[PDB]
Amino acid sequence: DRGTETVPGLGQRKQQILNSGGGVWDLAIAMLETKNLGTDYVYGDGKTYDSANFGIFKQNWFMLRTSTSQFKGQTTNQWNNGAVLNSNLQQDIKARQESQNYYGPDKWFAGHRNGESGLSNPYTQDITNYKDAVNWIHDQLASDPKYLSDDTRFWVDV
Numbered sequence: 723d724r725g726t727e728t729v730p731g732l733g734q735r736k737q738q739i740l741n742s743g744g745g746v747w748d749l750a751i752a753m754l755e756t757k758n759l760g761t762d763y764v765y766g767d768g769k770t771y772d773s774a775n776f777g778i779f780k781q782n783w784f785m786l787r788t789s790t791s792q793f794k795g796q797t798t799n800q801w802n803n804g805a806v807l808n809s810n811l812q813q814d815i816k817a818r819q820e821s822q823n824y825y826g827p828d829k830w831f832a833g834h835r836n837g838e839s840g841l842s843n844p845y846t847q848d849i850t851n852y853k854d855a856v857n858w859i860h861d862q863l864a865s866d867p868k869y870l871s872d873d874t875r876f877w878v879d880v
């Protein structure tokens with residue numbers, strides 16, 4: 723199922739994302755990641771090393787260290803270096819955009835959703851379901867410009 727819900731403060735975050743280099747596409751991805759477009763979920767989303775998640779998109783460390791200028795070349799053991807993305811939105815957005823530009827959208831979705839294993843199996847039903855969910859959210863956000871600044875959240879239960 724899918725739907726809408728009003729989240730106070732959401733329009734502020736939408737506008738900060740869109741004024742920090744993010745596009746409507748970035749907004750759709752982040753809207754699926756968290757309810758509040760925030761970074762205050764549990765540290766690393768409770769995961770460690772290559773599986774740890776950082777930033778408003780919950781990017782994993784494998785992706786960050788393999789495909790972003792800010793962390794390129796870094797090791798699995800260096801995973802705590804990704805925590806800076808939890809309070810630097812500009813670098814967070816740039817990292818995701820760079821990562822998608824390195825891998826391309828299809829493989830970026832696979833690695834974002836399933837890590838390094840996803841890169842070798844990028845068209846599973848689960849990755850496709852995630853891609854279809856982001857696309858649906860994007861199309862709802864694109865359907866009225868009010869959704870770029872109001873407190874409306876579009877959600878999908880992936």
Ligand SMILES: OC[C@H]1O[C@@H](O[C@H]2[C@H](O)[C@H](O)[C@H](O[C@H]3[C@H](O)[C@H](O)[C@H](O)O[C@@H]3CO)O[C@@H]2CO)[C@@H](O)[C@@H](O)[C@@H]1O
Binds near residue numbers: 754755756780
């Ligand atoms: O698996 C994708 C992504 O999901 C994040 O969790 C999202 C859920 O995907 C879903 O959108 C969820 O929506 C709630 C919604 O907030 C409302 O309360 C409604 O009544 O019930 C739905 C149940 O789906 O919201 C969460 C974010 O809070 C998150 O788990 C990511 O790690 C994950 O990659």
